[PDB]
Structures are given as structure tokens and as C-alpha cells.
Amino acid sequence: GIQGLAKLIADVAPSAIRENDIKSYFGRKVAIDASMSIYQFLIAVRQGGDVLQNEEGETTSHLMGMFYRTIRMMENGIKPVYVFDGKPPQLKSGELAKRSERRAEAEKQLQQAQAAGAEQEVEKFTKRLVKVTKQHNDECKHLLSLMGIPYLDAPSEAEASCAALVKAGKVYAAATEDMDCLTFGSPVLMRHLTASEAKKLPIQEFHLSRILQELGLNQEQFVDLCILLGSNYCESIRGIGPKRAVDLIQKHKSIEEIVRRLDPNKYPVPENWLHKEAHQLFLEPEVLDPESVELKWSEPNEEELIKFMCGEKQFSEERIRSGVKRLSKSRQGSTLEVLFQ
DNA sequence: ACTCTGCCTCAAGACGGT
DNA sequence: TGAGGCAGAGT
DNA sequence: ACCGTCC
Ligand SMILES: [K+]
Ligand SMILES: [Sm+3]
Ligand SMILES: [Sm+3]
Ligand SMILES: [Sm+3]
Ligand SMILES: [Sm+3]
Ligand SMILES: [Sm+3]
Ligand SMILES: [Sm+3]
Ligand SMILES: [Sm+3]
Ligand SMILES: [Sm+3]
């Protein structure tokens, strides 16, 4: 994530945000950050503070959400490809070590809530410790295969590979809630694309070209601004927030020039600042090759889906069968069968 | 006045019968 | 892998 | 649309 970027764009670059009705997206392809989607389901899909599960004690909240949300998108003619995280970049090792502290610190506090018979504090440290395991990813990949929905393994950060799929024109936008994708150069970011029937927030498109235009920056200058706002890969400058960062970038263009012209006593920079390495990461990240795999939306395997979701994971057979039928019908409406010449 | 930091909290999905 | 709200301090 | 329920 980029600290405050969403608010900054709304304040100084409003024309980069465009809203459209769900009906206008029939036939459009999008890339989804699968790991983020799983994380959201593990936190939100709960009954009595506990994730859904089968009698064997196996979590099914992530399968619940991925099954029904994916079908809803396809019913609206939206064809998603799910991108799974790979090995994180080394620059993130600092941010991850921090996530270990707040995790061990959150573990340090879950017991005192349970021991003292806490009421609603147990459910808080529970959610705080949610983490997507490789079993979660493998089960979702398994589900998507049976649903006929394509997925991809990113070599590193999924958001970077999503951005690369948009750049190559293999999907229209990266559908996620983190502004990371824009810093990785995604031409289009889409927010609030759940295709739910609730419909509370409007579908928002963030267009990078409009952002660069209203801020008067090129991409490398935009990346330096995001570094000054605050990223996951390096430190920012204390006392430099969104208002001053924009002014400094617009005036000095680069972080290097900002340092040379900054007053060490007023605004000292971090010691051994890795802004140059984070700069290279955002602009030239390790990403999948968009030309390798041709994305295909295939017929779902209904009977295997029943065996897996119902027989093993104990979903309602009526609901799963109904869902598979809706998915097959919606794919037939939005997708052309393969042709040979 | 404007700006930034560090606290606080609050939320975080979807189906289907009504 | 948050977003606002608020008080207090720096500019 | 609300809300009990999903697993
Ligand atoms: K800062
Ligand atoms: Sm990110
Ligand atoms: Sm419980
Ligand atoms: Sm089992
Ligand atoms: Sm620390
Ligand atoms: Sm990631
Ligand atoms: Sm990520
Ligand atoms: Sm992100
Ligand atoms: Sm079993």
C-alpha cells in the first residue's frame, strides 16, 4: 500500500477517478489479487467470530467467498483472472519483520483475552492473526480450476504482475483495493468491483494517465512521490507528508535532488535510505510474462465441484449446483468457444 | 494557518426467504 | 493487508 | 432491503 495515495488523488487529481455502472463492463477482463481476496474472506466470512468450516475442522470461508463472488462477476459478463503472490522481494523483509512483531505481540495478547474470559477481545486478536497459508492458496487454485476460471502464479508481488497484464493489454484493469498497482505502472486500477447485489459503493476506475497529467509528473517522478508518501519497501522522510511531498517532487523532480537541496537539520533523511532500491523495484519489478499463458474461461466441471464443495467441504448441494448452472450459463453468454483455422 | 505525527476507534462477504 | 477522527507539536 | 444463516 501507499500511505494516503487514495486520498491524495481525490484531493489534487479528481479527474483520474471515473465511476461507471456494472452493466457497462459486460465482456471485460480484469486481473484480481487472489491472496488479497482470500485474506478479506478469512476476516469477514465468519459466524459467531469463527470462520466457516466443515465438520473435519477445515476452513471454508475463503472457498465460500471465491465461489460466489466469482460467479457473480461472470453473471455480469466480467471475466476475472486470479493472480497469486509468489516469493516477496527482499526489500519487503523489513516490513515483514515488523509484521512478525505485531503478530507475536498480537499472539501475546490473544491468551490474556481467552484466559480472563474476554468477551469481544478474543475475536479482535483472532482477526489480527489471520494469515493466508499455502493450503488456502492451493484450495482456491483447485476450486478455480474446477470452475474453469484461469489463475496465474506471479514470481513475486501479485500486484506487479497484475499491472504487467494490464500494460500488455491482456486484461482491462487490475481489480484491487491497494493503490500499489498504480505505483507498479498499471494503466487502470478498479475499486469496489465485487459485483455484489448489495451495491453500496460505486465502481471506481483510477487512470494512471490522468494522475500523471493532473500532478504534472512522469512515472519515475510518480514512483518517487509514492516513496515519499510511504511504501512497504523503504522509509520516508519524517515531517514530509502528502502536501510537502507533492511540492518537493514537482519542484525537484527526483528524491536525489530533494536530498541535495534539503536542510539536514530541518528534514534529515533516514540513515542508509533504500529509496533507490525501492525506485528500481516499482519501475522494474519481477513479473510473469503476459505472453506465456493465454487466458481462457472454460466450462466448469459440475460433478467434481459437487464432490469437492459438497461431499468434502459440506456446502449445500442445492446452492452449489445452482451456482455452477448460473456460471455455465453466464460463460456461454459472454465467451466464444474456441475456433480452429 | 497549514502541515505532520501518533494516538484512538471502527470496519473488513454473500445467499436467500421474507 | 486501512480509513477517518482527534489532539498536540512542528513549519 | 432486512437479516438469519451459510459451513
Ligand atoms: K513521512
Ligand atoms: Sm502492495
Ligand atoms: Sm467463537
Ligand atoms: Sm479434508
Ligand atoms: Sm520496529
Ligand atoms: Sm503482495
Ligand atoms: Sm500485495
Ligand atoms: Sm497492495
Ligand atoms: Sm472429509
Author numbering: 2 to 342
Sentences from the paper on this structure:
The structure-specific nuclease, flap endonuclease-1 (FEN1) plays a vital role in maintaining genome integrity by precisely processing intermediates of Okazaki fragment maturation, long-patch excision repair, telomere maintenance, and stalled replication forks. FEN1 preferentially binds to double flap substrates with a one nt 3′-flap and any length of 5′-flap, including zero.
Asp233 is 3 Å from the attacking water and contributes modestly to catalysis; the D233N mutant has 16-fold reduced but still substantial catalytic activity compared to mutants of other invariant carboxylates, such as D181A21 and D86N. In all three substrate structures, the dsDNA major groove is widened as it approaches the active site, and DNA bases flanking the scissile phosphate are stacked with one another, with the +1 base packed against Tyr40.
